[PDB]
Coordinates of C-alpha atoms and ligand atoms in Angstrom, one line a residue:
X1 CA 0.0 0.0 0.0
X2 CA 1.1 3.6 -0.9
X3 CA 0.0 5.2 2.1
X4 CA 0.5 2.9 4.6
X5 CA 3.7 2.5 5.6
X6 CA 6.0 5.2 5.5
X7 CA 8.6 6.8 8.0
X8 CA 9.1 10.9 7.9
X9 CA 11.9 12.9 9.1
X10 CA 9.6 15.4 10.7
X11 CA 5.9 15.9 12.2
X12 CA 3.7 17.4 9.4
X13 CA 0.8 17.0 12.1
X14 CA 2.4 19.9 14.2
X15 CA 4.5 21.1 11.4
X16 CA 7.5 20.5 14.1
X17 CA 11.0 19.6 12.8
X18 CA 12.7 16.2 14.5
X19 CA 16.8 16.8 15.6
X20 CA 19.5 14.5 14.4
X21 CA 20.3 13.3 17.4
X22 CA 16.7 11.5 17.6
X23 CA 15.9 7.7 16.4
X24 CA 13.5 6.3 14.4
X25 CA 12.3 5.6 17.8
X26 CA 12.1 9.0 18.8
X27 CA 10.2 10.2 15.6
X28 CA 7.6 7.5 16.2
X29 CA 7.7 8.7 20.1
X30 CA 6.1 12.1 19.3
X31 CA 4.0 10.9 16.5
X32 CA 1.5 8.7 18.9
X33 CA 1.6 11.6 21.0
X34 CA 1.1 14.0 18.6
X35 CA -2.1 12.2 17.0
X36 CA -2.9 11.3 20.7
X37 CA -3.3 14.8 21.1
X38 CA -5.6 15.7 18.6
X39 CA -5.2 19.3 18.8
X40 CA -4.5 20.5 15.1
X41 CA -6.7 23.3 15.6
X42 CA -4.4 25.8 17.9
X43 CA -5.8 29.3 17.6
X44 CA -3.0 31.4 19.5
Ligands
LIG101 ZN1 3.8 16.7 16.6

């Protein structure tokens, strides 16, 4: 499948940029989170 699995550099859900010094693990860290959050709809 095309989108299905993938791996990103960065979080396009937050528009946030992941460091170098993170994993692959670290990326996926912040991604559950991120989508665990639900927030894409900060008005500040
Ligand atoms: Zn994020």
């Amino acid at each position: 499948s095309h989108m299905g699995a993938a791996a990103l550099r960065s979080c396009p859900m937050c528009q946030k940029e992941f460091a170098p010094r993170l994993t692959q693990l670290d990326v996926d860290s912040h991604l559950a989170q991120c989508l665990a959050e639900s927030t894409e709809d900060v008005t500040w």
